[PDB]
Design a protein around this ligand. Sequence first.
Ligand SMILES: Nc1ncc(-c2nc(N3CCOCC3)nc(N[C@@]3(CO)CCN(C(=O)OCC(F)F)C3)c2F)cn1
Length: 878
Amino acid sequence: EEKILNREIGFAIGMPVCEFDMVKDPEVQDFRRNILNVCKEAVDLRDLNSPHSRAMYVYPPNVESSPELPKHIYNKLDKGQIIVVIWVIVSPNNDKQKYTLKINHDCVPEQVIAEAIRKKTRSQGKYILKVCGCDEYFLEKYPLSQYKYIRSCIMLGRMPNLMLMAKESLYSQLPMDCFTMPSYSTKSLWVINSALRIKILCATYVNIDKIYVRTGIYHGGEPLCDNVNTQRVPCSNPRWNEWLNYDIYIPDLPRAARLCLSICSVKGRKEEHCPLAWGNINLFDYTDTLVSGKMALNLWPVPHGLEDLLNPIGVTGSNPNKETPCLELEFDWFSSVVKFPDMSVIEEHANWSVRENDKEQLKAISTRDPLSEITEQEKDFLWSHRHYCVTIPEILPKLLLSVKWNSRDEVAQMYCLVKDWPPIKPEQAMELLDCNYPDPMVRGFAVRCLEKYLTDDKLSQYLIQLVQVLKYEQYLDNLLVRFLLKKALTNQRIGHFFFWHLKSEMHNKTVSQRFGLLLESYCRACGMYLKHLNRQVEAMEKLINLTDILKQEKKDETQKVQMKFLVEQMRRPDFMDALQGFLSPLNPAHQLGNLRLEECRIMSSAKRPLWLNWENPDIMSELLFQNNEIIFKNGDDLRQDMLTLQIIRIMENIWQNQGLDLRMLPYGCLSIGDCVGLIEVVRNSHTIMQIQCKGGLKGALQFNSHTLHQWLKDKNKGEIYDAAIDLFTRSCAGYCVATFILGIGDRHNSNIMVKDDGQLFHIDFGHFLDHKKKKFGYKRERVPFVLTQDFLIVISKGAQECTKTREFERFQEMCYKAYLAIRQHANLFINLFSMMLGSGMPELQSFDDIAYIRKTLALDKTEQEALEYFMKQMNDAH
Ligand SMILES: Nc1ncc(-c2nc(N3CCOCC3)nc(N[C@@]3(CO)CCN(C(=O)OCC(F)F)C3)c2F)cn1
């Protein structure tokens, strides 16, 4: 009954549900019960206009955020009209009959259906349109061209193939709702007029000259007073029994104040100080109670490259592995439960607390990026004009950093300004969810802006950042988690990726409990989709096990011997059952039928990825792709690839909306677990090395700089030649600018690919945010801007003086405009990286890595000065 559901939830999370029942922490048990209200709200929203609302939960419309088509995309249409093919399965014989329509690009799905019924009858509202080849439906009254598949077809010059289906055929297959409620369902802070003191008792599980406890009171990475240390003791005896006194009074403690601890080592050789373990504690609990009495905290291992003695950004709470350094502490008891004051009380205290050159200086401060330095004079300038700031709402992040958070008088006044602040755009509100803004009223404002202005499309686009910033929340139950869970439980496409973003981090013990509890409530209310997720989990476990054996046990063996083990392991019954008949985690609309074993190989690229091939079992698979090819890789942190691919997509939208048709290729990529994941294979593509080692002769100098252009001319003879050179130029321009801005390394000719039609794209983003310079080669082949002689020959249509042709001038102008369009949206890009700073991605571990984008974008120069910097970089590559 519930034991069946709990066993299936346990298999999905990879953690038994009875482990959550064993947790005595009241915050954990209150979260498990209180989050069920979000589940019941999502389940009721799903049945509002049942079964149409249920069908749109399982098969939501995959649309762009705006119906507006840029003038250059409207020109791809024939007088504002599109040609679409509508298919029908007639039965008997199950014949495929097509009916070709020419309709207005903005026709709603029912107008398309009516026109297909008209064309078919030439020889009422009971039908739906489905994309041929995949489980994607057009159930909503959006203009046809707003659906991503139709929008993609217009831009890619392809013909839409849709399938006409009976409404009953789909609705009858929707399972009934199975959400069932689980069985597990004062003094004021401001009247204490003393300074804060905390007792450090003793440590256990700590076996070096001396050891000490370093402590500090922080609010979002910023110290609220000076750090205070215990006395140094010789390692063997870590008993301190010492009260530490802080220079901060209890009423001046902000709501998100934390105690940040560390056990540090001292070595006398200049005294060498090293942190051995760290732990942070929220000074107020989830019920707003100031902590008091004895407490024990199990500490965490120091993350690589900490560089400081404390870890104030790190996760809050005790290490679940109790067999780690354990610090015992004691807080004061003020003869009653102390609580943070009510909003009305804070509002009463805020009231009791109280040129044109200046209006332009406030506007300039407002447009600076999240990493730009804000001086002490500027902080005083911003806070003194805090009332004029409400009229430039985009300055709220700069103003929040000007507040003295260790002063309840300034904070009470900031709460009044936050309460009446005008709503801001989601890309600006997302910055207020990073580690710099722990205050719940600031965070609450930010989430309300997201609920008001975020479409389901933009929510999906920014899901990686929103799931990562959950780690920064002080408590399990918060406004952000409730917003994401409700969205995941009301749109199954969002729920699918939301599941995988949490599941893929369950190995990280700093988030295991938060994400595991969040996963339990999602699995309990996602419905029958849990059965599909379990099949995805089990197929991925079989591949992770297979690739682990290959990388550890049979690593050195030859390709033939590796393939013999692969084929033998894949032909096993348990393996075949697990790897066939499940949905693609890259896109759950793609069904993965039978494995085409003969087409599966171990690739010769770094970490030896697996090239897998499945039949697409859709009745109309021929109209999309007969076979789904996916790369499964063990060894890379594919979250860097996910972050880069998201940025490329956003950069492409910036360019497209500005009339700059720089065709990019952000193929799918999904992190499945610890350095494991899936990569979408782009069909009909070849690396530059493969093109060069086809026109190259055995024994002769390989990697010649004229093969690329020759191969493209043989593939595009005639009028289609001009289109291929143009597509190559635009795509190469976009990828030169993108790889430059982001500092993408390993730009060898096996990581740069080309399609038959001329489209160039990059792969493998295991290196970003640096100039990784080759150990050998020519000066022009080792500069940050990567543009080869091979590309210049294609761009100039074969000319020998390629840097002098008119086609190279047109390619240069493309690069200049593409560079400036991204520099205008720099704040967004800096913020998307900054939100990921605590993920543990090998190439993004500090603000110095993000500072690389501030240099390539030349944010500390003027618009004209940045363009000349970019021109000098382009010129260095030739
Ligand atoms: N982090 C990370 N990111 C990307 C990759 C990766 N990705 C792709 N691509 C393929 C195209 O679609 C996009 C993904 N290919 C790879 N290997 C090859 C190219 O180097 C080796 C020969 N090969 C081929 O012949 O493919 C046939 C044709 F499709 F290209 C593919 C590869 F390692 C790995 N790790």
